[PDB]
Each structure stands twice: as C-alpha cells, then as structure tokens.
Amino acid sequence: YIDQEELNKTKPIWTRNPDDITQEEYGEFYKSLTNDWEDHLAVKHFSVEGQLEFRALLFIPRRAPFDLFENKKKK
Amino acid sequence: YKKFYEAFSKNLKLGIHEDSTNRRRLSELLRYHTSQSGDEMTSLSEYVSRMKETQKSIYYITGESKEQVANSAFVERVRKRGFEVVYMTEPIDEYCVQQLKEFDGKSLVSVTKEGLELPEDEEEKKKMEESKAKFENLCKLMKEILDKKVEKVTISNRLVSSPCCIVTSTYGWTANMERIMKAQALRDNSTMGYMMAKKHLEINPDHPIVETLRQKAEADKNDKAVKDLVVLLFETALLSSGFSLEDPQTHSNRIYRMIKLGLGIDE
Amino acid sequence: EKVTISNRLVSSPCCIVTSTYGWTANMERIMKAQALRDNSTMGYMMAKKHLEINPDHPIVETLRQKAEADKNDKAVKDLVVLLFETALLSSGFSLEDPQTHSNRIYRMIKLGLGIDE
Amino acid sequence: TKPQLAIVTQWCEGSSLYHHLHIIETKFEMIKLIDIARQTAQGMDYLHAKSIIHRDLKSNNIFLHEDLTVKIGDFGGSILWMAPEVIRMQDKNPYSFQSDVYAFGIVLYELMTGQLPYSNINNRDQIIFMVGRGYLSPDLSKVRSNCPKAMKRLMAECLKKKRDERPLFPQILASIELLARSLPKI
C-alpha cells in the first residue's frame, strides 16, 4: 500500500499579513513554481482594496529565461 | 514564373527550412543565377542535366553582393576547368543551404570547407607533393611568428592569381552568417565563446613573393622585416574573405606609412 | 554628392559624413544585413554620403600644389580613389569589390619591391 | 522616416554526442554528467510511455543542444552490441522493450565510462559463430573507480539469468532521483 498526501503541500501565500513575512519562505515558495537550482532576486507584494478587489505577487528572476525568442508558443 | 518568383521567394525559402513531410517535393521550385547564364535564372533540377562524369556533388558559393561574389579569389581555379557553380547571396540563403544537404543522390558542398579536392590528371600529384615535401620548413617556421589565430596553413587548389585566402572549418560557423548573427538584434552575448569556426589560411606557391621569402628565410633566422611583411599580408588576407577588422587604425597607419615615401622625404 | 571642409579632424586626411536625414554607417549595415530584409524598395532609398578634408596634413598640401600644375594628370586619379576607399573602409562602410582593392595593394607592394616584368 | 519595430530570430543548431566521446572532452565536474543522465532518462521514459519503440538509440542519435539538452535523432558504443535477439530471425518479430532497456543501460554506462569496449579483437564472422555457441561475458576489470552504489547495484541486478525480468522505467527514474538528491555533499 501507499498513502500520498503530497498532492497539496504548498500552502497559499498571498493571504497572510505582509509585515510578518521573512525571505526564506519566499525562497521555498519560489522554488516550487519553476524546478531549478537557484533562488530569486527581488519580490513585490501589494493589493488594491478599492471598488475593485484583488491582490498580486511578482518576482524577479536572477538569470534570463533562455527561451523568450519564440513567436506564438503558450505563454 | 519570373514575376511570381521575384515577389514571394521569401515564403518558399522560409518554408523549406521548417517542414519535414514535404521537403524533397519542394526542392525544385528554386531559381538561381549560375555562371553560364548572364541575366537569366536557372533551375537546379534542370542543372542536373549537364555535368561531367567523374564529378561528384554540386558546388556553390554564398556572398554579400552580386558583383562582389561574381569575381572572387577562390573561384579563379574552379572556373578555368569549365565546371558550373551557383550563387546564393542572401541572408536566408544560408538558412536554406544549412539544412538541405542532398538532391537526387548528390551532395551540396561549398568552396570554403576544409580544402576540397577534385579528381584530375595524375602528373600534377607528384609536383604538388614535391612542394609539400620541399616547403616544410617555411610552413614550419611561419606559425611561430603568428600567435594562436590560425589553425593550419597549407597549399591547396583554389589560387591562381592571389597569394593568400582564408577558409573555415566544417564544424563551425561560416563568414556570412557570422554577420547575420552580429546584425541580429535580440540575441545573447554568451554564444560567441563556443561555436566560432576555427580559421584556416591558404598560400599560393606561384606568386614570386612566396619564393622571395625563402631566400631571407634560410638567410635571416628572424628580424623586424619578416614580422612586418607577414603581419601586413595576413591582415590584408583577412579582408579578402569578407572579414571585418577590429582595429582599422592599425592597417590605415600601415597604408599611410608608405604613401609618404611615395613623394619622398618624410623628414 | 558634396565635398567641404569642417572642424572634426586632427590627423586624418579625410573622413566621411552622413546626411541630416539618413541612416548612419552601423544603422544601414545592421538593417541591410538581416534576414527578411525586403530590400526590394526600401533598400534603394537611404544612405546619402558626403566628404571632408583636413587642411593640415601635409599630404593634402603637396597634393594641391601638384594638382595646381597639371590639370589632367594620371597619378591624381588613382591616388585620390585610393584615399577615398581607405577612408571608406575605416569608417564602418563596406567596399563593393574587395578583389580590386587587394589587387591595388598587391601591385603597389610588388612595385615597391621593384619586381616589374 | 517611416520607422520600424524589432524582429526576432528563429533557432540554432546543436552539436552531436559521439564526437565528444573520442576527440574533444572539455571535462567539467561529473554533476553535469548526472544531469545529462536524468534529462535523457526522463525524455526516453516519456517517449516509451506511449507504447513507442525506438529500434535504435545509437550514441550518434543525440544532439547536445543549448546548454546540456538532449535531442534524439534517428538517421545515421552499442551499434553492434545489441542482444543476439537481433540475430534471432525466427517468427520475424524478436523486437521487444528488453533490448531497448539493455541498450540504454550499456550506452549510459559507457558514456559515463568514456571509452569503447571490445576494440582489440574484431572478427564479425567469428564473433557470430562464437555467439552461436560459447558466448562470452562482459569484462569486470573495465569499471570506473567512482561508480555510484545505487547505479552499480541497478546495473548488476539488471541481467542475472534472463533478459526479460527487467524492471519498468519509473522506478529506475526514482533510483536516479534519490541517488542524485542523496549525495550533493551530505
């Protein structure tokens, strides 16, 4: 037999209080978005609780992606 | 077909690059200018008609301008024997010729690929190898003064009216795409390290200059004059194959150095 | 098109300049040397050029005092075209026929070596 | 006067593999070799996952593209080293996944090793007659010093009695991934 719970292991991250956040956890979360051997360089978190409601999270990779000169692949 | 081919040739030349199911079928709708038709395009399929018997594979060249390639230093040997060649002088022509490598049992080989040889009469073999076995020391001692730029210098058969020329290697890039890549806008700058093609120099032991070098070679072991003459001739040869120098002042000074002797008194 | 004198040179006999409405050397080269060039019409439109001379390098002065004597001389034409082409090469442009160029330098060095025949 | 906008490229050619085996090495640390192994194993597993045969994976059929990336070729170390299953010409269908598994094993082992087995004695007719009766066994002295324990155990366990009870691909992949992510330094 086998029991496999790892189908969901990455906890959602864009909901917590911005102040209580360290850098390492950003590190592990960024690891499990693109399988690689490196960390990020900068991050950005904010939100706009206006008449529109939403939130966003952005990263800045260290090394440029090698495949950006395509034309119409699935972006 | 003349008015059609002048307009939408870009589409076919691109399509031949990226497709696999239908490539052999598309290998005949191309029209080129050959060295038997002054101002008329010639089909390559119809070209398959008239070749010699012992010959193998089609011969071709790629250049930058029609006239610039029309009279090139390499050709002056393969043109005297009555063969037939074609000119693909356009950036996409390199893309087409790079991928396609065959046509109806034949091969596509260009002039500047690691010293091509053509079958011919027997008696020329012995004199050429005599030049091989007699001119080993000048070929030996010239590599010392030239540091690690060229790979090898030899005597081959593409030169009848020019002393020197430059040819590339099989595993590597070619001269015209060396400029298609620099002229390309959105590209990385880490790729030049690896697949630059190593360079080969070719000498002609017919021009009296090379023989005049021999007397000072066995006469003087080394001095300033040999260094000056060799760097001058090499830098001139670098221009001969469409290569662009990195320090034009260095050669401009060397060309201005003697025009002052032309009228006499420098000082 | 035009020939004039300006203040841009200290040690060069001549240099080349572009028009106020015209692509520079590197721009024209990079534009024409790229695939899908579509050179059918746009290619035969741009790259106007001019010329300048410095009145300081004694070569131009001796050239002028030679030309003031003979008005139909022989060495004047090949000398001037040689200077024109050398400035052309050492300015970012590309020559039309390198073989003739190399031939001129080859004959020059040969005659300097005094070979003849 | 009627401006423009930038234009992009198309793509570039990669280099081969087998050329690297004899002439030019350009040796970095073996971590790159293990990375090559894991990408190529993943790729061939994906290919075979759709019940797809290959019928050959000769070491020349690999193009080393940008960085270290394998592209599998088809057109023209184990080019003469397949099982006598090829020599079997009974029922005209000896083809099976077992030959592909064994060929991948020997090819990757030699690619790690870096040099050719069986280069001293070469007699095709006598080799095949000896295959008929008196078949040989692989040499054991020809082995690398730093042979990883997991890979050594896998390759030893692959062929014991019959070349038919070989394992199935993803547990090989799991062994690859555990051995890779079990010895960076700690």
List, in sequence order, every residue forming a beta bridge with B164; answer none if it has no partner.
B203
Residue B104: which residues within 8 A CB-CB, separation 6 or more?
B48
Element (DSSP H or E) covering residue D62: strand D62-64
Calculate the CA B266 to chain-centre distance: 39
The CA distance from B4 to B12, in Å, is 11
Q: Between chains, do C102 and B71 touch, taking CB under 8 Å as contact?
A: no
Nearest to B44 by CA among B62, B55, B57: B57
Best residue of C90, C91, C104, C113 to probe chain B, by most B CBs closer than 10 Å:
C90
Chain B positions touching D15 (Cβ under 8 A) are 171, 195
String of DSSP letters for B228-251: HHHHHHHHHHHHHTT---S-HHHH
Q: Is D150 exposed, middle or buried (0-12, 13-18, 19+ CB in 10 A)?
A: middle
From D14's Cα to the closest Cα of chain C, the distance in A is 21
Structural biology method used? cryo-EM
Chain A positions touching D180 (Cβ under 8 A) are none
For B105, the domain range is 22-267
From B104's Cα to the closest Cα of chain C, the distance in A is 28
Taking CA atoms, C54 is separated from C18, C51, C59, C87, D44, in Å, by: 17, 10, 10, 13, 69
- Strand residue runs (E) in C40-106: 49-53
| Contact status of A35 with chain D (Cβ, < 8 Å) | no
From D1's Cα to the closest Cα of chain C, the distance in A is 8
Q: How many CB pairs under 8 A join B and C?
A: 68
Q: Between chains, do B68 and C96 touch, taking CB under 8 Å as contact?
A: yes
The CA distance from B165 to B159, in Å, is 8
Chain C positions touching D1 (Cβ under 8 A) are 21
Best residue of A68, A69, A72, A73 to probe chain D, by most D CBs closer than 10 Å:
A69
Q: A42-69 in b/e burial notation, b at 16+ Cβ within 10 A? A: eeeeeeeeeeeeeeeeeeeeeeeeeeee
- The bridge status of strand B164-167 relative to strand B199-203 is antiparallel
- Name the D residues in 7-26 with CB < 8 Å from any B CB: 7-10, 12-13, 15, 19
Q: Which long-range contacts (CB under 8 A, 24 or more apart) does C58-61 make?
A: C59/B259, C59/B260, C59/C13, C60/C13
> Residue A64 — φ and ψ, nearest 5°?
-65, 140
Chain B positions touching C101 (Cβ under 8 A) are 239
3-state SS class at B126: helix
The CA distance from B162 to B205, in Å, is 10
Chain D positions touching A71 (Cβ under 8 A) are 8
Q: Is D77 exposed, middle or buried (0-12, 13-18, 19+ CB in 10 A)?
A: buried
String of DSSP letters for chain A: -----TTS-S---TTS-GGG--HHHHHHHHHTTS--S---SEEEEEEEESSSEEEEEEEE-SS--S----SSS--
| Contact status of A71 with chain D (Cβ, < 8 Å) | yes
The CA distance from C88 to C82, in Å, is 10
Q: Between chains, do B252 and C101 touch, taking CB under 8 Å as contact?
A: no
Q: Check: CB of residue C95 under 8 Å from CB of residue C105.
A: no
Active site residues of D: 56
Q: Between chains, do C90 and B183 touch, taking CB under 8 Å as contact?
A: no
Nearest to B230 by CA among B167, B131, B139: B139
Q: Between chains, do B18 and D9 touch, taking CB under 8 Å as contact?
A: no
The CA distance from D55 to B80, in Å, is 49
Give ∠ CA B176-B186-D72 in degrees, rounded to 5.
Answer: 75
| Tokens of residue D13, six digits | 């050619």
Q: Check: CB of residue B86 under 8 Å from CB of residue B33.
A: yes
Residue A11, phi-psi category: left (phi > 0), alpha (psi -120 to 50), beta (remainder): beta
The CA distance from B196 to B171, in Å, is 9
CA of B92: which chain C residue's CA is closest? Answer: C35
Chain D positions touching C21 (Cβ under 8 A) are 1
| Contact status of D6 with chain C (Cβ, < 8 Å) | no
| Tokens of residue D37, six digits | 């192994």
Q: Between chains, do C34 and D1 touch, taking CB under 8 Å as contact?
A: no
Q: Check: CB of residue B234 under 8 Å from CB of residue B199.
A: no
Q: How many CB pairs under 8 A join A and D?
A: 5
CA of D16: which chain B residue's CA is closest? Answer: B171
The position carrying tokens 């090559």 is D36
The CA distance from C52 to B8, in Å, is 42
